[PDB]
Amino acid sequence: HPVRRAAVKILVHSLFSMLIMCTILTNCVFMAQHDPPPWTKYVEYTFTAIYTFESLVKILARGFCLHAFTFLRDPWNWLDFSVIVMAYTTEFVDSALRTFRVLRALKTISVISGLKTIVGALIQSVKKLADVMVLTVFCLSVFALIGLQLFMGNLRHKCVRNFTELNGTNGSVEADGLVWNSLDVYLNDPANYLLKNGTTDVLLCGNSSDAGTCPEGYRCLKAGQNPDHGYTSFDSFAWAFLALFRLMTQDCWERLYQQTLRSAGKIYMIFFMLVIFLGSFYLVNLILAVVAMAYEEQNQATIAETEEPFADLTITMCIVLNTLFMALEHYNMTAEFEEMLQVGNLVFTGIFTAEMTFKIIALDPYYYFQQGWNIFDSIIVILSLMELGSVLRSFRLLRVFKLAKSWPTLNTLIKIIGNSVGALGNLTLVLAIIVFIFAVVGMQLFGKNYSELRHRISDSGLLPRWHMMDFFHAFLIIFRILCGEWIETMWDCMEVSGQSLCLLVFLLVMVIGNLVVLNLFLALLLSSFWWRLRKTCYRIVEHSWFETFIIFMILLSSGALAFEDIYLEERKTIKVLLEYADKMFTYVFVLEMLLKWVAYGFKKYFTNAWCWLDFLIVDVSLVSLVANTIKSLRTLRALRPLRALSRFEGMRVVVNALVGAIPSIMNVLLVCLIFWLIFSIMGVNLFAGKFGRCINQTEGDLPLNYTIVNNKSECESFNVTGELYWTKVKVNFDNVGAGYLALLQVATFKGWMDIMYAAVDSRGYEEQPQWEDNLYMYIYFVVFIIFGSFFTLNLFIGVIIDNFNQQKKKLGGQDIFMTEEQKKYYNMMKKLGSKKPQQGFIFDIVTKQAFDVTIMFLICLNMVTMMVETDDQSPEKVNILAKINLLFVAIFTGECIVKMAALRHYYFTNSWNIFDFVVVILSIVGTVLSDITLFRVIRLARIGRILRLIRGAKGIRTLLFALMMSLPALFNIGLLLFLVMFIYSIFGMANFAYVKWEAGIDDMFNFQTFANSMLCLFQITTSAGWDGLLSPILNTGPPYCDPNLPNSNGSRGNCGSPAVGILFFTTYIIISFLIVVNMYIAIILENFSVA
Ligand SMILES: CCCCCCCC/C=C/CCCCCCCC(=O)O[C@H](COC(=O)CCCCCCCCCCCCCCC)COP(=O)(O)OCCN
Ligand SMILES: CCCCCCCC/C=C/CCCCCCCC(=O)O[C@H](COC(=O)CCCCCCCCCCCCCCC)COP(=O)(O)OCCN
Ligand SMILES: CC(C)CCC[C@@H](C)[C@H]1CC[C@H]2[C@@H]3CC=C4C[C@@H](OC(=O)CCC(=O)O)CC[C@]4(C)[C@H]3CC[C@]12C
Ligand SMILES: CC(C)CCC[C@@H](C)[C@H]1CC[C@H]2[C@@H]3CC=C4C[C@@H](OC(=O)CCC(=O)O)CC[C@]4(C)[C@H]3CC[C@]12C
Ligand SMILES: CC(C)CCC[C@@H](C)[C@H]1CC[C@H]2[C@@H]3CC=C4C[C@@H](OC(=O)CCC(=O)O)CC[C@]4(C)[C@H]3CC[C@]12C
Ligand SMILES: CC(C)CCC[C@@H](C)[C@H]1CC[C@H]2[C@@H]3CC=C4C[C@@H](OC(=O)CCC(=O)O)CC[C@]4(C)[C@H]3CC[C@]12C
Ligand SMILES: CC(C)CCC[C@@H](C)[C@H]1CC[C@H]2[C@@H]3CC=C4C[C@@H](OC(=O)CCC(=O)O)CC[C@]4(C)[C@H]3CC[C@]12C
Ligand SMILES: CC(C)CCC[C@@H](C)[C@H]1CC[C@H]2[C@@H]3CC=C4C[C@@H](OC(=O)CCC(=O)O)CC[C@]4(C)[C@H]3CC[C@]12C
Ligand SMILES: COc1ccccc1OC[C@H](O)CN1CCN(CC(=O)Nc2c(C)cccc2C)CC1
Ligand SMILES: *[C@@H]1O[C@H](CO)[C@@H](O)[C@H](O)[C@H]1NC(C)=O
Ligand SMILES: *[C@@H]1O[C@H](CO)[C@@H](O)[C@H](O)[C@H]1NC(C)=O
């Protein structure tokens, strides 16, 4: 027919596809509006017609029925079919159903081949991630059972008032001179709880020695509701699964850490690291490795298919001077300094214009515009000239990128950014489509709920900071979820709207968006990347007993440092013991240094770096001793543990690897500093002096209304009473150094809440912040996070991994983070890993795979039975569960004994047999003990039965074997990390003790004692809540802290030191990043690939 020919001709024509794409984009723009005006209703038909028209065409050319090369045969045409039928259903007859219209956005993926291919590759990646997903579910369930057993109902502890019975009249309580109907109704009343200081949270409390303490007049009691609206708790197994999924993603995990330790006890912190350093880091890095290998296979398949005048120095110096001159800007500039800045900028732009004109005269426009850099310079100079005749100046900053001409690593960053929207732009487009789809889905589903039930989730009188009422805020929430903060807003979402639907939407966006982001990250990363005396001295130094003695002295001296608590002044004998011990260590180490000098001579001793370190430490000790016979030099004694680096080979080899990587690390650090200089200068221009708040101290610590107080001038003018304080946010953009600090907090994603809240309220220059005017400053931070964090971390990781690959290649292909003995044990483990394979009625029955499958089903059923445990369960439920446990123990005993009925070969045939034997023996031990927190441990011992699942699983077994193979390298890395934690905790004890308790620093997670400092350092090893700890350090003087305070040891107030605090926290954050992220990822990926 001719109709078929016409339909085919219109179908194949590119104009038709372009029309479909344009209408899809227009519909996407219309779906952004939260409140569609009535007239747009008419426009709806247009789309419904167009979507019909095109569909009709596809129906005419192809065949509706099923057959080769037909309409419904193509999977994506199902999208057209569903969209058209849904549109007709919604419009023809009678709504939340309209949210399904968002699926029309996916038509974009249909109208471009590149997006189809990208989605296909993503689907194969998801398919390959199946084993890791199963392992993650299994580990999360196991740790969730462990946490449920350990902390069942712990989070419901609260410091309630100490009630008194009214002479047992009717079981009533007369607390605080008020009678309540019953004890149960009294306890559930939140008017008698105790709020945590400076927070709107009920103080969790415990009765264990380590757990938190109830202030005088209060007592710990379990009655109440779980914290943060009751969505965090270990009471039910499913709640524990949610909490440990939160832990695994390290999402606001410091809050759960602090709550659990406050309620149960500090010792339980152990549990947390066993879930973080082996449950969170390990699982995420395993996912990283699996995705990377899948992408590598995809790239290999694609590759196989494809197969078959000296003035430049002057200009660069001028650019460097100009960028530095722009960096000479800050808050409260003097008039003369501002004039000097203006004159300098004017002369710089003048000279740049003159150079551009001269070198465009030398080569005419045809020649001049022949270079990309030349057109870039022309655009920059034109923009600067237009601005000369406000962020309009920031364009000039981009000139610094010219330094990429001969800077290879800045060129690598430029290549990364180019590939982001170049070769790999299709995947970026897919990510953008996903983000838009999820933003509109969330807004359409939750806009009315957020609007009409705002008071539920709005602590302030106005609307909440994060919501889905408007499209921009929905996109902001989706972006925040992508950045990793997916639960803090989820609690509000579930509180204001449906729990089930919000759970589903947020979990889906988390999983899918993080998958896409990780695919983009890995794709970019792979795409872009006397004589007798001397003899005696040598003999005495050479004895191994001498080395052991020196090691013992090093460790014991470090321990002696570990006692410098605030409580020494109370402990007298220990103080004098420590003084004598310190003198002894100084003397013995000096004696050892002299012996080494004599035995080996000055040249050999001073030609060894570690000898230099030991000599420096001893020199500091001697300087301190002679000064005593400098107070700022005493605290440098906290570097004593560094003597342990040279002795133990594990830390020595790890330090060798890190030193080898130092040059590349420094190159990338310089590139990152130059790149972040642009964003810090822009932030200084946008937000210099606009971060101040005229707070009223008496009425809390919240910014005043902009109507009553408008700016600093009015804040000082209304000073009849000394209540108003014009204070600036701790971390801000008043300078470029403060710019780097705030940018670091935004990039690491800790403490960015306050920075963005202060930015998106910046009303003017030192003017009082309005609630949320100047809103679109949000974009600023978003942009930064796209470049300053995503691409910057990509460069970090790529360069460091490339450096480690070069180091491995140089070292004969062997490992980098292992010793000789560890290498031999690793070889033995590898050999053991791939070992080759080696009454009649029962022998024939048990050996059958059906028996193993039945045992597997039985153990799965037992796991399900343990999932049912819950706090405050009725006694009959307890009895039934105990009986079921006894039955399961009996069944396992029966199966093990019938297996034993075979010859003794099974007694040693495999290691899993002995594991089964020992777990059964423990099971009977626990059951017999039941006839007699020890009970909690006995119950927790039952989790060993679940591990029997490992036998059947293949992917689980391989991944766990990879972890076991990686264990020694991780042991070395963790040893070095623990040494660094020890040193930094001693520094904190020396400095940060006595600081005012605010934000992260509370009565339990202080820096006062070694225990508390170690807890804080452990939590901020993952960079979690380091802004919280840093905040109390920064504040100096009123109204925050009170200097001139009678402190125990150092009576110079309770204020922190901003300079040393910032240095301490930034250096520790960077060191911990390096080690735990880069090295741990390197080990995980290497041992997974080899495994
Ligand atoms: C081949 C061998 C290579 C490995 C050895 C090289 C690495 C060793 C490290 C050198 C960096 C140490 C620099 C010392 C900084 C101390 C400055 C200082 O004394 O001030 C103090 C600074 O304290 C701080 O918080 C800064 C924290 C800096 C930590 C440096 C220690 C890092 C230890 C880990 C080494 C690196 C990782 C392991 C080795 C790769 C404050 O006291 P105050 O000012 O006197 O207070 C006044 C009233 N109390
Ligand atoms: C996860 C991270 C990925 C890797 C990071 C890549 C490198 C990006 C780095 C950024 C370094 C951070 C620099 C922070 C500078 C802090 C400046 C600041 O706080 O404000 C200034 C005052 O405070 C001070 O910092 C003065 C003391 C100087 C501290 C020096 C900090 C050294 C930087 C840490 C080391 C950098 C990393 C290198 C590691 C080997 C001025 O502002 P103000 O409003 O006038 O207040 C006056 C009160 N004194
Ligand atoms: C009886 C009252 C208290 C209401 C009942 C609420 C529970 C039935 C809900 C509350 C929150 C829900 C949890 C919220 C979060 C998760 C995380 C989610 O994690 C994953 O999806 C992991 C995916 C992966 O491993 O990649 C699995 C469902 C789960 C446990 C949900 C299971 C059901 C829970 C516990
Ligand atoms: C009356 C009050 C407000 C005076 C306080 C002003 C200072 C806080 C300003 C004046 C000089 C400024 C500095 C001028 C020059 C630089 C160079 C600039 O150099 C870099 O580019 C470092 C990073 C790199 O090497 O790329 C970093 C910011 C800094 C230290 C500036 C930080 C803020 C400073 C110290
Ligand atoms: C009190 C009422 C209002 C709420 C009761 C909670 C239920 C509605 C919870 C119980 C288990 C929850 C489900 C548990 C797990 C998921 C997995 C989640 O999907 C993933 O986690 C992605 C997995 C992957 O693709 O790898 C989507 C939400 C969903 C279906 C949850 C939806 C909500 C459910 C059904
Ligand atoms: C109203 C009062 C009595 C509250 C009682 C609630 C409990 C009886 C609930 C809370 C947690 C629930 C469990 C949460 C999660 C699962 C996982 C679920 O896992 C599966 O085996 C199905 C998915 C799969 O493995 O393919 C089986 C049901 C079970 C044990 C649920 C059974 C019912 C439990 C124990
Ligand atoms: C009507 C009156 C008596 C109200 C009280 C009823 C309770 C005694 C019920 C409510 C929930 C029930 C539980 C719900 C779910 C399970 C899972 C079920 O799972 C299995 O373990 C199956 C395998 C097996 O046990 O053989 C075992 C019974 C048990 C614990 C039930 C035991 C009896 C419970 C505690
Ligand atoms: C108010 C008082 C009574 C509180 C006492 C609480 C302590 C019992 C807690 C707080 C600090 C905790 C420790 C902090 C740091 C570590 C390091 C961690 O790393 C290692 O030490 C492994 C290598 C080694 O064996 O040294 C092991 C757990 C441990 C000892 C923690 C165990 C429990 C501790 C000692
Ligand atoms: C990298 O993320 C993750 C890694 C591991 C487990 C979970 C993760 O969260 C998922 C997603 O990556 C969200 N990220 C965004 C950026 N990230 C910054 C960062 O790496 N901080 C950091 C530092 C400075 C030192 C040590 C360890 C870490 C994680 C924070 C979290
Ligand atoms: C407060 O409660 C505690 C709980 O044991 C009790 O010992 C005490 O007598 C009560 N009264 C106070 C602290 O004044
Ligand atoms: C006070 O602040 C709120 C939000 O910060 C704002 O909506 C209101 O207009 C301000 N003025 C008042 C309450 O008089």
Residue numbers in the entry: 119 to 212, 217 to 430, 718 to 798, 806 to 945, 1193 to 1292, 1301 to 1509, 1520 to 1613, 1622 to 1780
Paper passage:
NaV1.5 is the predominant NaV channel in the heart. Voltage-gated sodium channels in eukaryotes consist of tissue-specific high-molecular-weight pore-forming α-subunits of ~2,000 amino acid residues that contain four homologous domains (DI–DIV). Each domain of the α-subunit is composed of six transmembrane helices organized in two functional modules: S1–S4 form the voltage-sensing module (VS), whereas S5, S6 and the P loop between them form the pore module (PM).
A total of 2,154,834 particles were analyzed to yield 165,532 particles used to perform 3D reconstruction of the structure of the ranolazine/NaV1.5 complex at a resolution of 3.2 Å. Ranolazine blocks rNaV1.5c by binding in the central cavity of the PM, physically occluding it and blocking ion permeation. The ranolazine molecule is positioned asymmetrically in the central cavity of rNaV1.5c through formation of close contacts with the S6 segments of DI and DIV and more distant contacts with DIII. Ranolazine is located directly on the intracellular side of the ion selectivity filter, ideally positioned to occlude the ion permeation pathway with its positive charge, while its hydrophobic regions interact with the nearby S6 segments of the PM. In addition to these distinct interactions with amino acid side chains in the AAD receptor site, our structure reveals a bend in the DIV-S6 helix resulting from the adoption of a π conformation for residues 1,765–1,769. The π conformation of DIV-S6 induced in NaV1.5 by ranolazine binding suggests this transition may be an important part of the gating cycle for voltage-gated sodium channel, which may be captured by ranolazine binding that traps the IFM motif in its receptor site, as suggested in recent molecular modeling studies.
